[PDB]
From a paper:
Recently, several unexpectedly diverse compounds were reported to deplete cyclin K by linking CDK12–cyclin K to the DDB1–CUL4–RBX1 E3 ligase. Here, to investigate how chemically dissimilar small molecules trigger cyclin K degradation, we evaluated 91 candidate degraders in structural, biophysical and cellular studies and reveal all compounds acquire glue activity via simultaneous CDK12 binding and engagement of DDB1 interfacial residues, in particular Arg928. Crystallographic dissection of 28 ternary complexes demonstrated that despite considerable diversity of the molecular glues, the overall complex architecture is highly similar. The low-affinity DDB1–CDK12 interaction primes the complex, while the ligand, through filling the kinase pocket and bridging over to DDB1, drives robust association, offering a rationale for the unusually broad chemical diversity observed.
To further explore the contributions of SR-4835 structural features to its activity, we evaluated various derivatives. At R1, an unsubstituted benzimidazole gluing moiety (DS55, (61)) showed a similar binding mode and only slightly impaired recruitment (EC50 = 36 ± 2 nM), while exchanging the benzimidazole for an indole (DS56, (62)) largely abolished activity (EC50 = 2114 ± 252 nM), highlighting the importance of the two hydrogen-bonding interactions provided by the imidazole moiety of SR-4835.
Numbering used by the authors:
A (entry chain I): 20 to 267
B (entry chain H): 715 to 1038
C (entry chain G): 1 to 393, 708 to 1140
Write the structure that this text describes.
């Protein structure tokens, strides 16, 4: 009925982009830029966080079936954001997205949009819809971070620090292929787990089962620590690679 | 696979004819070359390209993929026109929405007048309808176009609602501005006549109540061409909008503007005395002026009229026969 | 948009009701006869009826009753139309000037109601205190007859008994009392209520409820000497009055259902009863007077008088004379004699009034090679079945061919100088295990005869049990000579085989002209038949030869010749057959998206399909491909009675709600879809039920006839015997005649003060629309009958358009000439 949108890390060695000679680092950088492009454009337009993420999720999924050498990222990102707006009922006119994209992009980058930017973007909506197999509904870690946090009871400030730090980790994971590896529910737990470690908080005490040291298992069933650690490692790598550090 | 959408071409379905006029586009009928199954297709025209793909179609393509119910039409898949090879820009082909075809339509069954509805038929029809609505309302979605044409019935007696194009999500914890007058006037609730704009799910309930009485009278209850003339007819039967029956009516934009001729009293039970007692109570609750006092879909399913109806017996109506 | 014109060539002839009383004067005895939309007023003489006045009303007459309230010298007339237009009428004569007064009027339709199964019932109190109306289930409507109620305002009383069969006001009651038979799950019961105008509700009635015959049909209010009521059923007649109860169940009435009643002796001693087989009975109330001085009902007796036409209404006039009002056959005056004739009958016919009866089918044929065209109609039912040959000559000349069996379809085969007619006769399961016919008829009195011997369905193994006395239909193809109208040959079809379609044509390269009949195997178990046959006959040298047969999996409802091929409608499919050199039918192509393909019509390679609920669908045969293509469908849902093609773009239809509509190709080829919408541009409420649409004209054509403004000619036949003609107009002529109608309606006084615009408004129970695209020719043709002052009033400020002179004023003499040309189209 509904398509499978999750892959194994090993599988990303075989994206179309990889097989056309693009190396793993370049596709990784190309994904961050497009996701951040989608993030920055829509934030300038005042868009809800779900709308940005939905565009980003479309974007990530798109380049699992296609190559970065045949589809310029920034056109795709704009197209993903354009559709995401209508799907998440935060619509924007294509001309306004182009306007904002031009403001943020230099001249070389905006050359991807070609002579008629609107037309090159509109032509991609057809491919995008077919690529996402018309699977418009998307769930995001944000709703689970809040659904799960509501069940924690304790120091109001320590939990809010946990939520904001985890929230930031969610925003940062949109630049990675985690959206393609793990369901959003696991991501929400992983970022809670990561923030708990960094703030030296023991989350089990806030739960209804304080003696249940694996606190997350009451939110997300069947998640080994193996998975949460793999996610945390991938999140902190972005910080160690960049100049930015953990928010704390 | 069954999950792969947008790739299959319309070639596979052979177009038989045009079944009727829809909410936003005409509907057709076809048979798959591979499977004899008869289906129903709506053409989505992306040729205007003012802003790409139609947003209303995006609404129908989102909601339906989530809603699963025996009494809700299923979208099977989405197909496309022939696409030029290595010519993505040149391609102007349109998409189509595959739907399950239904043997009969309530609009044509009733308009012809051949069909005859016993109480037990009306029970089976209403029970399925309200169960579907309860499903959709439980999922926090609003249809907004309850009409005879969108109501479809198989020969077996199974019913399903159809064109979800005008449907939009409803936000309970926080109200949002909407598109004011939506439902066909004959079945539009008083709140939309007065412009509530931030309409509640009860707009669909009122419509189905208008349908319920229509089944017994074999005639639409409220027939007019002017929104005020409709309000007059509604007032003559259900009582005129007034602060006692609708405490918050004064907050409605047109309460002062749009006024009935008189402050008519409610005669619903009197005028509908012929309707059975179990059903008349349902109508009085479904056709309640105040959206806050109007019954819910679940309450209609827990009524004497519908609670004890068994969906195992679907009571098909007296669809036409040869001496007929 | 489209423009068309409707004219009534022959008025409705079937008698829908009839009453007697003192309406024109307190002194004369009147007979008021109601035909659909027409009221005829007669005065009773010692020889027959003297006509005095006839009026038209803008509505179907549903209720017609005469009453005389205290203070009036003479009877007043109440009429209610089927669209719920009520009025009280008075006859007034000033010397030679006869006019009808509208004393009170109004529309009594309730905004909310469920129309009753047994139809509108109207009754009036013996003290003329109120009019009772049964319009909707569960409600009783009362119009009180006070002097001030000139608008006929009324109220409803809630009625617990939802399914009422019949009701009457009773005689001899302290308060207005109703007696009625009703049905609930426990059977049928009789019950009484009292009506209180003061309280506006029912009070407990004078006598109790009793279980009555399951098929109790009619209620008779017995007059003051006896009081109470009589209840007529299928097997028994019963008298009820408080403690008194009688029941007579004579075997003679069980044979045929009784449908009409009238009172012979004002005191209630004698009544007349009629049944669906045409028999006329006398019901006698045998009196017994006690020494108390009171008069009681001793017994009931039923005596058979003779045979009349199957009668919708009976009314005894005076002496021995009875008027028999017939809807299925010719109406009559008959005299009842005290002494029987040598055959045992007390009934002897005096006069016969022509009723075209139900016109099931009709065709136009120029028998005498005159260029005119005469109309041969399938008219009547059962014993009254007839073929009627109609020609123009100023009255219509009508010849009657008695068949005594029901006629179904008709078609002319010139090569054989004869007609083919499909017929059905009623036989009854008899003690031999076979059946016996109630009377001889056309299919049994044929010169030569044949019976189909097909074994196609003979494998059977499907059981159909037979009980003695049940009716069965026998269908036969009759070959009838065009000059003598003698039945030359009758072909009887297989047992339980119904004939539904008939054509006469040549096919393919076959030079022979054939009769082809489409049949369906009808078994009571089947909601829809699943077996049928198409049979090809040749009429040659006095004998009908079976040439070929094709089995089908359904009912052959309609057939039509298509460019050497046979186009047939079988259940949900439309099929085209080719006629091979081996003289057999072969399927070429099919179309399947119909609920029931009931009617078909062809022009060129185009085909119009009429469905039970999908209205009209426009097909085309595509010869390059060898198949059908859907061209366009009417998306407004309708129940079709007959369709016709007007021209390559306009299509005519007839609804079961007495409505006529015209669909056209959307004529805008912007998108394929727009043309596909057959848009209803014409809407009109005829008020009659159209069964057959047929191209042709009855007007003599000498080739000298001035070319009329109207173009085309479609004649139609109806259930009530009305015959009409539909023709097309130019945009200019429509506007002129339309603008004139609006002017005529302001001038002409309607009986009952019924608005003409309302009368012609499209009316289904669910929806009502203003008429469009149609000119009521009868309203236009009434211009010639309005007085001169009124004529000049109509033409004031009237301008022509699109003519030799763009704007041209009209005079009364100019319009008189235009209408006079329009009266020559029919
Ligand atoms: C999601 N979705 C599903 C559907 N859909 C599926 N089946 C139907 C359907 N069939 C009834 C029917 N029409 C016929 C025409 C000719 C012969 C037989 C016919 N039987 N009618 C209609 N309509 C469209 C508006 O006019 C009437 C109601 N809509 C349908 C639409 N949207």
């Amino acid at each position: 009925t509904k398509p499978c949108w999750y892959w194994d890390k090993k599988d990303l060695a075989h994206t179309p982009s990889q097989l056309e000679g693009l190396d793993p680092a370049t596709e990784a950088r190309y994904r961050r830029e497009g996701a951040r492009f989608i993030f920055d454009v829509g934030t300038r337009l005042g868009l809800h966080y779900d709308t940005l993420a939905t565009g980003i999720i479309y974007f990530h999924r798109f380049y699992m079936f296609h190559s970065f050498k045949q589809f310029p990222r920034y056109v795709t990102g704009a197209c993903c954001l354009f559709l995401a707006g209508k799907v998440e009922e935060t619509p924007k006119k294509c001309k306004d997205i182009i306007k904002t994209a031009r403001s943020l992009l230099n001249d070389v980058q905006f050359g991807q949009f070609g002579d008629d930017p609107k037309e090159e973007v509109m032509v991609l909506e057809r491919i995008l819809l077919q690529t996402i197999k018309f699977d418009l509904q998307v769930e995001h870690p944000y709703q689970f971070l809040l659904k799960y946090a509501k069940q924690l009871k304790g120091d109001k400030n320590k939990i809010q620090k946990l939520v904001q730090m985890a929230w930031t980790f969610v925003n940062d994971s949109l630049c990675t292929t985690l959206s393609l590896q793990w369901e959003p529910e696991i991501i929400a737990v992983a970022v809670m787990y990561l923030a708990g470690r960094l703030c030296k908080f023991e989350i089990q005490e806030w739960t209804s089962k304080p003696m249940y040291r694996r606190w997350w298992e009451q939110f997300v069933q069947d998640v080994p620590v193996d998975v949460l650690e793999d996610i945390c490692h991938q999140i902190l790598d972005l910080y160690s690679q960049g100049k930015q550090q953990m928010p704390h | 696979t069954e999950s792969d959408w947008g790739k299959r071409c319309v070639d596979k379905f052979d177009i038989i004819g045009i079944i009727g006029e829809g909410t936003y586009g005409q509907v057709y009928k076809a048979k798959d070359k591979d499977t004899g199954e008869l289906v129903a297709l709506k053409k989505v025209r992306l040729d205007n390209e003012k802003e790409g793909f139609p947003i209303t179609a995006i609404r129908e393509i989102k909601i339906l993929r989530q809603l699963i119910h025996r009494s809700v039409v299923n979208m099977k898949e989405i197909v496309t026109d022939k696409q030029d090879a290595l010519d993505f820009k040149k391609d102007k082909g349109a998409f189509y929405l595959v739907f399950e075809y239904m043997d009969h339509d309530l609009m044509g069954l009733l308009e012809s007048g051949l069909v005859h509805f016993s109480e037990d038929h009306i029970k089976s029809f209403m029970k399925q309808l309200m169960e579907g609505l309860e499903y959709c309302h439980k999922k926090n979605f609003l249809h907004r176009d309850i009409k005879c044409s969108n109501i479809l019935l198989n020969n077996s007696g199974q019913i399903k609602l159809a064109d979800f194009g005008l449907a939009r999500l409803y936000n309970s914890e926080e109200s949002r501005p909407y598109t004011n007058k939506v439902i066909t006037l004959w079945y539009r609730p008083p709140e939309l006549l007065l412009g509530e704009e931030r309409y509640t799910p009860a707009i669909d309930v009122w419509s189905c109540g208008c349908i319920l009485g229509e089944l017994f009278t074999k005639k639409p209850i409220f027939q007019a061409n002017l929104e005020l003339a409709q309000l007059e007819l509604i007032s003559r039967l259900c009582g005129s909008p007034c602060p006692a029956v609708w405490p918050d009516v004064i907050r409605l934009p047109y309460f002062n503007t749009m006024k009935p001729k008189k402050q008519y009293r409610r005669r619903l039970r009197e005028e509908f005395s012929f309707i059975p007692s179990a059903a008349l109570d349902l109508l009085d609750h479904m056709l309640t002026l105040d959206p806050s006092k109007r019954c819910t879909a679940e309450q209609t399913l827990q009524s004497d009229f519908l609670k004890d109806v068994e969906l195992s017996k679907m009571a098909p109506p007296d669809l036409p026969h040869w001496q007929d | 948009m489209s423009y068309n014109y409707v004219v009534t060539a022959q008025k409705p002839t079937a008698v829908n009701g009839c009453v007697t009383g003192h309406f024109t004067s307190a002194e004369d005895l009147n007979l008021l006869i109601a035909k659909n939309t027409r009221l005829e007023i007669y005065v009773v003489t010692a020889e027959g009826l003297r006509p005095v006045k006839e009026v038209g009303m803008y509505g179907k007459i549903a209720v017609m009753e005469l009453f005389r309230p205290k203070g009036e010298s003479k009877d007043l007339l109440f009429i209610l139309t089927a669209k719920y237009n009520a009025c009280i009428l008075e006859y007034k004569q000033s010397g030679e000037s006869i006019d009808i007064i509208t004393r009170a009027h109004g529309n009594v339709q309730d905004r909310i109601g469920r129309p009753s199964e047994t139809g509108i019932i109207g009754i009036i109190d013996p003290e003329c205190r109120m009019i009772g109306l049964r319009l909707y289930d569960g409600l009783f409507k009362v119009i009180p007859l006070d002097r001030d109620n000139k608008e006929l305002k009324a109220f409803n009383i809630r009625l617990e008994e939802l399914h009422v069969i019949d009701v009457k006001f009773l005689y001899g009651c302290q308060a207005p009392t109703i007696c009625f038979v009703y049905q609930d799950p426990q059977g049928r019961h009789v019950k009484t209520y009292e009506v209180s105008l003061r309280e506006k509700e029912f009070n407990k009635g004078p006598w109790k409820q009793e279980n009555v015959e399951a098929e109790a049909s009619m209620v008779i209010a017995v007059p003051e000497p006896f009081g109470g009521a009589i209840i007529i059923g299928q097997e028994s007649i019963t008298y009820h009055n408080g403690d008194k109860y009688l029941a007579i169940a004579p075997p003679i009435i069980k044979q045929s259902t009784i449908v009409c009643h009238n009172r012979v002796d004002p005191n209630g001693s004698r009544y007349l009863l009629g049944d669906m087989e045409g028999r006329l009975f006398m019901l006698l109330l045998e009196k017994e007077e006690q020494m108390d001085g009171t008069v009681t009902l001793k017994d009931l007796r039923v005596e058979l008088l003779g045979e009349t036409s199957i009668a919708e209404c009976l009314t005894y006039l005076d002496n021995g004379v009875v008027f028999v009002g017939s809807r299925l056959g010719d109406s009559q005056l008959v005299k009842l004699n005290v002494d029987s004739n040598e055959q045992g009958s007390y009934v002897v016919a005096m006069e016969t009034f022509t009723n075209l009866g139900p016109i099931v089918d009709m065709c136009v044929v120029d028998l005498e090679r005159q260029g005119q065209g005469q109309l041969v109609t399938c008219s009547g039912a059962f014993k009254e079945g007839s073929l009627r040959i109609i020609r123009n000559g100023q009255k219509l000349h009508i010849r009657t061919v008695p068949l005594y069996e029901s006629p179904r379809k008709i078609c002319y085969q010139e090569v054989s100088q004869c007609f083919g007619v499909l017929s059905s006769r009623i036989e009854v399961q008899d003690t031999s295990g076979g059946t016996t016919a109630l009377r001889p008829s056309a299919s049994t009195q044929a010169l030569s005869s044949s019976v189909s011997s097909s074994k196609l369905f003979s494998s059977s193994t499907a059981p159909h049990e037979t009980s003695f006395g049940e009716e069965v239909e026998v269908h036969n193809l009759l070959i009838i000579d065009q000059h003598t109208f003698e039945v030359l040959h009758a072909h009887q079809f297989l047992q339980n085989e119904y004939a539904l379609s008939l054509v006469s044509c040549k096919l393919g390269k076959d030079p022979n002209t054939y009769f082809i009949v489409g049949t369906a195997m009808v078994y009571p178990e089947e909601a829809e038949p699943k077996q049928g046959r198409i049979v090809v006959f040749q009429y040659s040298d006095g004998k009908l030869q079976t040439v070929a047969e094709k089995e089908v999996k359904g009912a052959v409802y309609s057939m039509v010749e298509f460019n050497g091929k046979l186009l047939a409608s079988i259940n949900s499919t439309v099929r085209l057959y080719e006629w091979t050199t081996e003289k057999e039918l072969r399927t070429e192509c099919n179309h399947y998206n119909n609920i029931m393909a009931l009617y078909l019509k062809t022009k060129g390679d185009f085909i119009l399909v009429g469905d039970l609920m999908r209205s009209v669908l426009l097909l085309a045969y595509k010869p390059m491909e060898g198949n059908f293509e859907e061209i366009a469908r009417d998306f407004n849902p309708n129940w079709m009675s007959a369709v016709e093609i007007l021209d390559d773009d306009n299509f005519l239809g007839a609804e079961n709600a007495f409505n006529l509509f015209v669909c056209q190709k959307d004529s805008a080829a912007t998108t394929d879809e727009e043309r596909q919408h057959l848009q209803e541009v014409g809407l009109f409420h005829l008020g009659e039920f159209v069964n057959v649409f047929c191209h042709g004209s009855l007007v003599m054509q000498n080739l000298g006839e001035t070319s009329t403004p109207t173009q085309g000619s479609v004649l139609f036949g109806t259930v009530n015997g009305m015959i009409g003609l539909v023709t097309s107009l130019s945009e200019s002529w429509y506007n002129l005649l339309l603008d004139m109608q609006n002017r005529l309606n302001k001038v002409i006084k309607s009986v009952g003060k019924i608005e003409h615009s309302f009368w012609r408004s499209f009316h289904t129970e669910r929806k009502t629309e203003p008429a469009t695209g149609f000119i009521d020719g009868d309203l236009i043709e009434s211009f010639l009958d309005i007085s001169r002052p009124k004529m000049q009033e109509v033409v004031a400020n009237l301008q022509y358009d699109d003519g030799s002179g763009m704007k041209r004023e009209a005079t009364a003499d100019d319009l008189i000439k235009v209408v006079e040309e329009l009266t020559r189209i029919h």
